[PDB]
Design a protein around this ligand. Structure first.
Ligand SMILES: Nc1ncnc2c1ncn2[C@@H]1O[C@H](COP(=O)(O)OP(=O)(O)O)[C@@H](O)[C@H]1O
Ligand SMILES: CCOC(=O)C[C@@H]1C(=O)NCCN1Cc1ccc(C)cc1
Ligand SMILES: [Cl-]
Ligand SMILES: [Cl-]
Ligand SMILES: [Cl-]
Ligand SMILES: [Mg+2]
Ligand SMILES: [Mg+2]
Length: 265
């Protein structure tokens, strides 16, 4: 079906571990999209074919306004190409670098959009597991979109794959390699809410080793400017025991969320 010669390639949109992502236009229709390019050699050396397969399977069948579409894929002798919905306003990661911290209204609005998307996923027992600002994209109206489903799975689950870079968004049971479920994404939601308001993640440290210790002991503190309501929500999400973390419905109905968010459920 699709091949490289069907597209004109444009500027680089971003780079991940495996993904080299470019703007592109389909020649016959003039349809603008994002082409995520992957090198078969690297996919093989790291043995993550199964993650590539998860990404395509999951993200092509999901349909939600806060989840990035994957339209299809093709490959040649050396590369795999994923055909993605283009997100024109970039990453939440980039927006945070620009603004330093987000106000309560912006933050609550992003958390609602996240909770809506995750509620859709969890209803199929799909868990994302890699929710962080570089994987959160922005639509033409500034709406948040979850992307990069390569680490996703069906719960419950173990971990058969070596962890990559930062531990900053992972809960104790994932880093300790224990069994885990949907509640992992709730922990990550708590980390994100804190980082949006404060400008950095709550367990950040100088070394992998120290970050690990801070996560497993749940050692975090708040700057004076974080309000009582935000503190309440964040403290409920960052519980060591996953069974004690709230349901997404409880997040969406939290008074600090309903008081400050621009969007509904
Ligand atoms: N659809 C898209 N629209 C705009 N930018 C994108 C899109 N997809 C990815 N990017 C940019 O490319 C980066 C890497 O993409 P990602 O799919 O997260 O790669 P990896 O799987 O290697 O982490 C993202 O962090 C983002 O900056
Ligand atoms: C849906 C998962 O796969 C594809 O996206 C494309 C295509 C296919 O249809 N099945 C699997 C082999 N092939 C891709 C491939 C990827 C990586 C390496 C190292 C070799 C081959
Ligand atoms: Cl497993
Ligand atoms: Cl795994
Ligand atoms: Cl729920
Ligand atoms: Mg990524
Ligand atoms: Mg990936």
């Amino acid at each position: 079906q699709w091949a490289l010669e069907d597209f004109e390639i444009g500027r680089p949109l971003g780079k991940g571990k495996f993904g080299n992502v470019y703007l592109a236009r389909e020649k016959q229709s003039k349809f603008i999209l994002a082409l995520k390019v992957l090198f078969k050699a690297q996919l093989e050396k790291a043995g993550v074919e199964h993650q590539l397969r998860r990404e395509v399977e999951i993200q092509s069948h999901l349909r939600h306004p806060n989840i990035l579409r994957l339209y299809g894929y093709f490959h040649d002798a050396t590369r795999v190409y994923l055909i993605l919905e283009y997100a024109p306003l970039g990453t939440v990661y980039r927006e945070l670098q620009k603004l330093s911290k987000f106000d309560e209204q912006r933050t609550a609005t992003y958390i609602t959009e996240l909770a809506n998307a995750l509620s859709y996923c969890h209803s199929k027992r799909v868990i994302h597991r890699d929710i962080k600002p570089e994987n959160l994209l922005l639509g033409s109206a500034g709406e948040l979109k979850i992307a990069d489903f390569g680490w996703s799975v069906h719960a419950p689950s173990s971990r058969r794959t070596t962890l990559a870079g930062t531990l900053d968004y992972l809960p104790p049971e994932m880093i300790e390699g224990r069994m885990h479920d949907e509640k992992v994404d709730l922990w990550s939601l708590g980390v994100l809410c804190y980082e949006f308001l404060v400008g950095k993640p709550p367990f950040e440290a100088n070394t992998y080793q120290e970050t690990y210790k801070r996560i497993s002991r749940v050692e975090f503190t708040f700057p004076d400017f974080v309000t009582e309501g935000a503190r309440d929500l964040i403290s409920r999400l960052l519980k060591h025991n996953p069974s004690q973390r709230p349901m997404l419905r409880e997040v969406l109905e939290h008074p600090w969320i309903t008081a400050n968010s621009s969007k509904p459920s």
